[PDB]
């Protein structure tokens, strides 16, 4: 059993869309097999691993509701654990102590690159008989095996083979006490007992280096699965120029977490039949073998309509909880108006993003100072007060305030008084909304209270009464 | 129950979208209950019943694939049938022969409008005087005066009209021609129509048609009047809102499946489901589910409906409708890829068949000059060497497939170390002429190896203008 996946991002300042999909594959697989999902932070890069950068990762994880069972663990700590394993490998002989200077190390790399070889450190200090010990500063390296090769069955890329002759005895501790990054990964995956590694594509070169270290210090080597990169619109790697790149920028743009997670799953992974999956539906049907090795392009137009569906498909109460954030972005006093769960029922089919719903809704909660200049010139003086005064005093006739009673009440006008339906509904729309674009008239004027209805109808009557 | 629905449009010049939805409900109701769908023509208005105007109805029904079991019947014909029933009805006590002149009617209507509703009095209802022998006159129908008329409308509920509001309407003019309200009754009786599904404006004519059906011993059918289709501002659908004729949507690049699916959703609602096949619309259709309220026309959703059906329907069927818009663009489709294959390429990109006929000429015809704008960014001298290795590698493969094309562009940008976008984009501008196209694996494959080199070298002959 003990299935344990991991997500160990290096802080970039935010949560990259490609990194969120990687975390989703590691999170779906841990939940698929009833395992644990561990969170880890690669904050050794002290410049870009700011406290705001680390929070932007966890805040992005929480919005997508990708909760973790263990963590988060930080690589800036556990240094005493890292040096404890290094001292262990020095005693067992699996790691030696190099004494070459940086002058000879750079002269070795320039000679191999010139000679048409691969930059690898030869075993000069691997089995050196030259003494130079104790008080002298030095670095320690990992005695990489020389014979054979390492082959790991990648669930995404298939069988991958790396000859041991192209892997060097990598350094695992610098001149100072700090250990190198690759050694900080093998012990973390060992101490946390990771069984399935799901990371990006560019980490494939360090995978055979990490396996030979785990096999050395006697550790259960996990099965690796490297997901391909996400390409943009023109076939290049996904960047900020292709569109929104951070998961929180999509939250600012007016998206739902279910819409983004359902689209990132469809990038590479496929089920054939479906395009829309629920959270629990992704857990069951997810298979690493189904993820494609080819890179997928990012279609922002498809993601938008994916968001439009989830706005009207998800429960109106839950969509309202995400609508509240963009409501505060537009700064709207939502005390005197309809419910938020009832607001998404009105503006559901109209707009395709929550930002577009927070906008074009202020007339449901707040009064407007002026009218729309073009919409005001539409309902001029002729036959404007005649249909407005009869419908204003007819809406307040009922005690049961429902949109059904309003429809037949608005139906009374333009039918009892011979006139077109657009000759009263359009002036009524501009009266209560201020513009000439809104949902159904019977439903729009019902969400607005009967008080603010006659207040804004008489407001237009005082406006059309300006022939002087 | 031997269910029989009908669709009898009056030729307005074309096929209104609202009229097609009415024909769609009657066709669905007949196919749901294993009945017959009959077709009738109200071509009595000889001014707008042009042979071109009546044909636009026939081919519009055929475009939506709304085949009929009976018909088409024409009200221009069966005039002897219309004159034979009134003569039989004149023999019975249900229809008399009025004789009042046009002067008495206007003087009575203006007197009835002056007193405390214009309803013709029964002056000739029980007159024993022959009044004339062959002089001009008008035949009318004796309307019942006691009680009411009630018809259970399946959409608008129960509607009641008092018989005192229905006057003895005219059923035959002075020139012997019969009126419209009587022609509908005799047609629906000889054709054995069990369910009537028509527009909303015929709700006032329903009680008059039933009192004639209650007379002469006739089975009264069940009526169901659909609500009008309103536009963006709440008024009836007109040309100012957008496309109105069904054939205008074929010109604009739509499919019959996309238009029928959207008109079905207008009013009739079946849960969260939005996309139905023709067979699903036959099964799940319920006449009571049609809402009494009027629904506005959302051209944005209809565009999304068509985008789905382009990629959901078989590519060979979409190719048969795409052929009409290729002829509109006047594209020589002799050298390029197959039409059914073209739908696979431009499928997820465009949302209408006109948008597919456009932005596809470079697959079939060569372009004289480039877009310049996209060339100025990708035809720089730095790309003259990526283009010299792709064409030498594109021809190295004997098996011409999109996969072997990708491996050719993959050998490039690796031998000459550079980003893959720095070779595929100049290849995209050289082969397509602009900076937008599907995947380069299928774009240069569908165009061909011969026309590729002819366009790569065309770019090489152009990018060599650094002087
Ligand atoms: N921190 C690395 C991943 C390290 C790993 O998964 O081994 C990244 O964000 O790309
Ligand atoms: N011909 C009428 C319909 C007649 C009927 O359905 O009874 C129309 O086009 O509106
Ligand atoms: Zn050394
Ligand atoms: Zn008379």
A152 Cβ contact partners less than 8 Å away, ≥ 6 residues apart = A159, A160, A207, A208, A211, A221, A223, A224
CATH code of residue A129: 3.40.50.620
The answer to whether B425 and B378 have CB atoms below 8 angstroms apart is yes
Tokens 């790309």 sit at which residue?
A: B383
Among B26, B199, B210, the mutation site with the greatest number of ligand 2 atoms within 8 A of its Cβ is B199
Residues of A whose CB is below 8 A from B234? 421-422, 425-426, 441
Cα–Cα distance between B255 and A331 in angstroms, integer? 44
Q: Test A407 with B304 for CB contact under 8 angstroms.
A: no
Q: Which of A330, A329, A326, A331 is nearest to A311 (CA)?
A: A326
Centroid of ligand 2 to alpha carbon of B91 (angstroms):
30
Q: Which of A113, A82, A319 is nearest to A188 (CA)?
A: A82
Residues of A whose CB is below 8 A from B298? 349
In a domain, A330, yes or no: yes
Q: Test A305 with B301 for CB contact under 8 angstroms.
A: no
Tokens 């989703």 sit at which residue?
A: A24
Cα–Cα distance between A41 and A49 in angstroms, integer? 9
Q: Does A414 share its domain with A443?
A: yes
Tokens encoding B424: 């595929």
Handedness of CA A281, A282, A283, A286 (dihedral sign): positive
DSSP alpha helix (H) spans, A380-447: 385-395, 403-412, 422-433, 441-447
The answer to whether B289 and B269 have CB atoms below 8 angstroms apart is yes
Q: Is B52 helix (H, G, I), strand (E, B) or coil?
A: helix
Q: At what angle do helices B386-394 and B449-463 cross, to 10 degrees?
A: 160
Centroid of ligand 4 to alpha carbon of B167 (angstroms):
12
Q: Does B414 share its domain with B436?
A: yes
The answer to whether A298 and A306 have CB atoms below 8 angstroms apart is no
Handedness of CA B344, B345, B351, B354 (dihedral sign): negative
Minimum Cα–Cα distance from A349: chain B residue: B301
User: Where do the DSSP E strands lie in A310-438?
Assistant: none
Quote the distance between the C-alpha of residue A441 and its chain's center.
Answer: 38
Cβ-count burial of B457 within 10 angstroms (0-12 exposed, 13-18 middle, 19+ buried)?
middle
| A18 pocket-lining for ligand 1 (C-beta < 6 Å) | no
Cα–Cα distance between A286 and B52 in angstroms, integer? 58
Cα–Cα distance between B137 and B101 in angstroms, integer? 8
First to last CA, chain B: 86
CA distances to A328, B181, B187, B205, B206 from B184, rounded to whole Å, are 60, 6, 5, 10, 10
Q: Tell me how many degrees the CA angle A375-A376-A378 measures, rounded to the nearest 5.
A: 65
Q: Does A149 share its domain with A204?
A: yes
Handedness of CA B367, B368, B372, B376 (dihedral sign): positive
B422 Cβ contact partners less than 8 Å away, ≥ 6 residues apart = B382, B383, B386, B413
Tokens 């009959």 sit at which residue?
A: B38
CA distances to A79, A409, B367, B368 from B371, rounded to whole Å, are 59, 58, 10, 10
In a domain, A310, yes or no: no
Tokens encoding A325: 């954030």
Annotated binding residue B137: no
Q: At what angle do helices A207-216 and A181-191 cross, to 10 degrees?
A: 60
Q: Does A270 share its domain with A377?
A: no
Q: Is A268 helix (H, G, I), strand (E, B) or coil?
A: coil
Q: Between A349, A421, A441, which is nearest B235 by CB?
A: A421
Q: Binding site for ATP: residue ranges of A?
A: 240
Cα–Cα distance between B449 and B433 in angstroms, integer? 16
Largest CA distance in chain A: 110
The answer to whether B44 and B76 have CB atoms below 8 angstroms apart is yes
The answer to whether A421 and A411 have CB atoms below 8 angstroms apart is no
Q: Test B348 with A299 for CB contact under 8 angstroms.
A: yes
- Which residues of A belong to the active site? 240
Question: Number of C-alpha atoms within 13 angstroms, CB side, residue B96?
Answer: 17
Q: Test B234 with A299 for CB contact under 8 angstroms.
A: no
Residue B44: CB atoms within 10 Å: 17
Q: Does A321 share its domain with A203?
A: no
Element (H, E) at A247: helix A247-253
Tokens encoding A435: 């513009």
Pairing of strands B170-172, B138-141: antiparallel
Which residue puts its alpha carbon closest to atom 9 of ligand 1?
A9
Number of structural domains chain A divides into: 4
Which residue puts its alpha carbon closest to atom 4 of ligand 2?
B8
Handedness of CA A385, A386, A388, A393 (dihedral sign): positive
Compute the 3-state secondary structure of chain B and give helix, strand, coil in percent, each to the nearest 5: 45, 10, 45
Nearest chain A Cα distance for residue B421, angstroms: 6
DSSP code of A414?
T
Cα–Cα distance between A200 and A228 in angstroms, integer? 6
Which neighbouring-strand residues pair with B73? Answer: B40
CA distances to A7, A256, B131 from A307, rounded to whole Å, are 26, 7, 77
> Which residue, B281, B305, B329, sits at the end of a domain?
B305
Q: At what angle do helices A181-191 and A79-92 cross, to 10 degrees?
A: 90
Q: Binding site for Zn(2+): residue ranges of A?
A: 98, 100, 125, 127
DSSP code of B177?
P
Element (H, E) at B149: strand B148-153
Cα–Cα distance between B57 and B245 in angstroms, integer? 10
Cα–Cα distance between B389 and B409 in angstroms, integer? 9
CATH code of residue B416: 1.10.10.350
Q: Test A425 with B304 for CB contact under 8 angstroms.
A: no
Tokens encoding B55: 């044909």
Nearest chain B Cα distance for residue A73, angstroms: 36
Ligand 1 atom nearest the C-alpha of A9 is 9
Cα–Cα distance between B359 and B331 in angstroms, integer? 11
* Beta strands across the sheet bearing A95-98: A95-98, A139-142, A171-173
| B23 pocket-lining for ligand 2 (C-beta < 6 Å) | no
Contacts by residues B174-183 (CB-CB < 8 Å, ≥ 24 positions apart):
B174/B136, B174/B137, B174/B138, B176/B83, B177/B79, B178/B79, B178/B82, B178/B83, B178/B86, B180/B42, B180/B44, B181/B205, B181/B208, B181/B209, B181/B212, B182/B82, B182/B86, B182/B141, B182/B212, B183/B42, B183/B44, B183/B75, B183/B82
Among B198, B200, B223, the mutation site with the greatest number of ligand 2 atoms within 8 A of its Cβ is B198
Residues of A whose CB is below 8 A from B420? 235-236
Cα–Cα distance between B14 and B244 in angstroms, integer? 9
Instruction: Kindly write down the DSSP assignment for every residue of B258-292, as one continuous string.
Output: HHHHHHHHTTB--TT-----HHHHHHS--GGGB-S
| A257 pocket-lining for ligand 1 (C-beta < 6 Å) | no
Residues of B whose CB is below 8 A from A436? 233
Inter-chain Cβ pairs, chain A and chain B, closer than 8 A = 33
First to last CA, chain A: 86
| A42 pocket-lining for ligand 1 (C-beta < 6 Å) | yes
Quick one: residue A360, left, alpha or beta (phi over 0 = left, psi -120 to 50 = alpha)?
left
Question: Number of C-alpha atoms within 13 angstroms, CB side, residue A196?
Answer: 26
Residue to test with chain A: of B228, B230, B232, B234, most A Cβ within 10 A: B234
Tokens encoding B286: 């319920």
Ligand lying closest to the C-alpha of residue A169? 3
Cα–Cα distance between A110 and A104 in angstroms, integer? 10
Tokens 């989830």 sit at which residue?
A: A310
Which residue puts its alpha carbon closest to atom 2 of ligand 1?
A9
- Which residues of B belong to the active site? 239
Q: Is A223 helix (H, G, I), strand (E, B) or coil?
A: strand
Buried b (16+ CB within 10 A) or exposed e, A45-56: eeeebeeebbeb
Cβ-count burial of A204 within 10 angstroms (0-12 exposed, 13-18 middle, 19+ buried)?
middle
Cα–Cα distance between B199 and B196 in angstroms, integer? 10
Q: Does B144 share its domain with B17?
A: no
Q: Tell me how many degrees the CA angle B26-B27-B30 measures, rounded to the nearest 5.
A: 85
Which residue puts its alpha carbon closest to atom 10 of ligand 2?
B9
Q: Test A441 with B301 for CB contact under 8 angstroms.
A: no
Q: Identify the contact set of chain B against chain A, taking CB-CB distances under 8 A.
A: 230, 233-235, 272, 293, 296, 298, 301, 304, 348, 419-421, 424-425, 439-440
Q: Does B374 share its domain with B466?
A: yes
Tokens encoding A296: 């997928």
Tokens encoding A272: 């054939």
Q: Which of A429, A459, A462, A464 is nearest to A368 (CA)?
A: A459
Which neighbouring-strand residues pair with A173? Answer: A140, A179
B444 Cβ contact partners less than 8 Å away, ≥ 6 residues apart = B394, B405, B427, B431, B452
Cα–Cα distance between B440 and B406 in angstroms, integer? 8
Cα–Cα distance between A263 and A251 in angstroms, integer? 14
Q: Test B420 with A234 for CB contact under 8 angstroms.
A: no
Centroid of ligand 1 to alpha carbon of A42 (angstroms):
7
Handedness of CA A227, A231, A236, A239 (dihedral sign): negative
Q: Does A55 share its domain with A88?
A: no
> Which residue, B167, B194, B225, sits at the end of a domain?
B225
Instruction: Kindly write down the DSSP assignment for every residue of A8-76, as one continuous string.
Output: -PPP-SS-BHHHHHHHHHHHHHHHHTT-EEEEEE-TTSTTT--HHHHHHHHHHHHHTT---SEEEEETT
Cβ-count burial of A19 within 10 angstroms (0-12 exposed, 13-18 middle, 19+ buried)?
buried
Handedness of CA A156, A158, A163, A166 (dihedral sign): negative
Question: Number of C-alpha atoms within 13 angstroms, CB side, residue B223?
Answer: 29
Cα–Cα distance between B36 and B27 in angstroms, integer? 8
DSSP alpha helix (H) spans, B346-465: 353-357, 373-378, 386-394, 402-411, 421-432, 440-447, 449-463
In a domain, A148, yes or no: yes
Element (H, E) at B95: strand B95-98
Pairing of strands A196-199, B70-74: unpaired
The answer to whether B338 and B282 have CB atoms below 8 angstroms apart is no
Rounded (10°) CA dihedral B160, B144, B183, B197: 20
Range of the domain at B209: 79-225
Centroid of ligand 1 to alpha carbon of B339 (angstroms):
46
The answer to whether A395 and A444 have CB atoms below 8 angstroms apart is no
Quote the distance between the C-alpha of residue B108 and its chain's center.
Answer: 45
Tokens 């009044």 sit at which residue?
A: B131
Which residue puts its alpha carbon closest to atom 8 of ligand 2?
B9
Q: Is B387 helix (H, G, I), strand (E, B) or coil?
A: helix
| B10 pocket-lining for ligand 2 (C-beta < 6 Å) | yes
Q: Test B272 with A313 for CB contact under 8 angstroms.
A: yes
Centroid of ligand 3 to alpha carbon of A131 (angstroms):
13
Phi then psi for residue A383, to 5 deg, are 40, 45
Cα–Cα distance between B458 and B456 in angstroms, integer? 5
Q: Which of B428, B463, B462, B461 is nearest to B447 (CA)?
A: B428
Q: Does A208 share its domain with A255?
A: no
Cα–Cα distance between A281 and A269 in angstroms, integer? 14
Cα–Cα distance between B95 and B458 in angstroms, integer? 85
Q: Does B68 share its domain with B155?
A: no
DSSP code of A204?
G
Ligand 2 atom nearest the C-alpha of B184 is 7
The answer to whether A209 and A182 have CB atoms below 8 angstroms apart is yes
Reported structure resolution in angstroms: 3.3
Cα–Cα distance between B327 and A161 in angstroms, integer? 55
Ligand lying closest to the C-alpha of residue A15? 1
Tokens encoding A86: 């290094």
Residues of B whose CB is below 8 A from A302? 348
Rounded (10°) CA dihedral A129, A132, A138, A144: 10
Buried b (16+ CB within 10 A) or exposed e, A259-297: bbbbbbbbbbbeeeeeeebeeeebbeebebeebeeebbe
Cα–Cα distance between B464 and B467 in angstroms, integer? 8
Pairing of strands A139-142, A95-98: antiparallel
Q: Which of B182, B184, B206, B204 is nearest to B193 (CA)?
A: B184
Quick one: residue B372, left, alpha or beta (phi over 0 = left, psi -120 to 50 = alpha)?
left
Ligand lying closest to the C-alpha of residue A171? 3
A377 Cβ contact partners less than 8 Å away, ≥ 6 residues apart = none
Q: Does A173 share its domain with A134?
A: yes
B376 Cβ contact partners less than 8 Å away, ≥ 6 residues apart = none
DSSP code of A460?
H
CA distances to A82, B339, B364, B450 from B335, rounded to whole Å, are 66, 11, 6, 11
Cα–Cα distance between A456 and A463 in angstroms, integer? 10
Q: Test B348 with A426 for CB contact under 8 angstroms.
A: no
Q: Which of B378, B440, B455 is nearest to B410 (CA)?
A: B440
> Which residue, B273, B305, B337, sits at the end of a domain?
B305
| A10 pocket-lining for ligand 1 (C-beta < 6 Å) | yes
Q: Which of B221, B210, B223 is nearest to B155 (CA)?
A: B223
Question: Number of C-alpha atoms within 13 angstroms, CB side, residue B448?
Answer: 14
Cα–Cα distance between A68 and B303 in angstroms, integer? 42
Q: Test B440 with A235 for CB contact under 8 angstroms.
A: yes
Q: Does A339 share its domain with A399?
A: no
């Amino acid at each position: 059993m003990k299935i344990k996946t991991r997500f160990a991002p290096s802080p970039t300042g935010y949560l990259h869309v490609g990194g969120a999909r990687t975390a989703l594959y590691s999170w779906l697989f841990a939940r698929n097999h009833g395992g644990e999902f561990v969170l880890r932070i690669e904050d050794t890069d002290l410049e870009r691993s700011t406290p705001e950068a680390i929070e932007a990762i966890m805040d992005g994880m929480n919005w997508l509701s990708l909760e973790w069972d263990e963590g988060p663990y930080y690589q800036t700590k556990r240094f005493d654990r890292y040096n404890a394993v290094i001292d262990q490998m020095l005693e067992e002989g699996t790691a030696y102590k190099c004494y070459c200077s940086k002058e000879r190390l750079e002269a070795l790399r320039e000679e191999q690159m010139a000679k048409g070889e691969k930059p690898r450190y030869d075993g000069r200090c691997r089995h050196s008989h030259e003494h130079h010990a104790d008080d002298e500063p030095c670095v320690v390296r990992f005695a990489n095996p020389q014979e054979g090769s390492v082959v790991f069955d990648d669930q995404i890329r298939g069988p991958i083979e790396f000859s041991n002759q192209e892997l060097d005895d990598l350094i695992i501790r610098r001149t100072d006490g700090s250990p190198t990054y690759n050694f900080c990964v093998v012990v973390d995956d060992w101490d946390m007992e990771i069984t399935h590694v799901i990371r990006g594509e560019d980490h494939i070169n360090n995978t055979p280096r990490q396996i030979n270290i785990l096999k050395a210090l006697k550790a259960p080597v996990p099965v690796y699965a490297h997901v391909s990169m996400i390409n943009g619109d023109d076939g290049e790697k996904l960047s900020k120029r292709h569109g929104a790149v951070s998961v929180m920028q999509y939250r600012d743009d007016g998206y739902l977490p279910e819409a983004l997670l359902n689209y990132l799953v469809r990038l590479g992974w496929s089920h054939g039949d479906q395009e829309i999956f629920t959270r629990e539906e992704m857990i069951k049907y997810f298979t690493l073998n189904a993820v494609s090795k080819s890179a997928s392009a990012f279609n922002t137009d498809k993601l938008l309509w994916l968001n439009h569906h989830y706005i009207n498909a998800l429960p109106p109460e839950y969509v309202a909880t995400h609508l509240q954030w963009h409501i505060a972005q537009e700064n709207i006093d939502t005390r005197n108006g309809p419910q938020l769960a009832d607001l998404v029922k009105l503006l559901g089919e109209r707009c395709k993003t929550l930002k577009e719903m927070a906008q074009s809704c202020r007339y449901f909660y707040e009064d407007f100072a002026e009218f729309d200049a073009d919409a005001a010139k539409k309902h001029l003086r002729p036959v404007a007060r005649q249909p407005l005064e009869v419908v204003r005093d007819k809406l307040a006739a009922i005690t049961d305030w429902t949109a059904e009673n309003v429809h037949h009440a608005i139906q009374a006008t333009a039918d009892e008084l011979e006139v077109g339906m657009g000759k009263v509904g359009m002036p009524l729309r501009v009266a209560v909304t201020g513009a000439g674009q809104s949902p159904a008239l019977d439903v729009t004027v019902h969400a607005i209270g009967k008080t603010r209805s006659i207040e804004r109808i008489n407001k237009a009557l005082d406006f059309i009464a300006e022939r002087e």
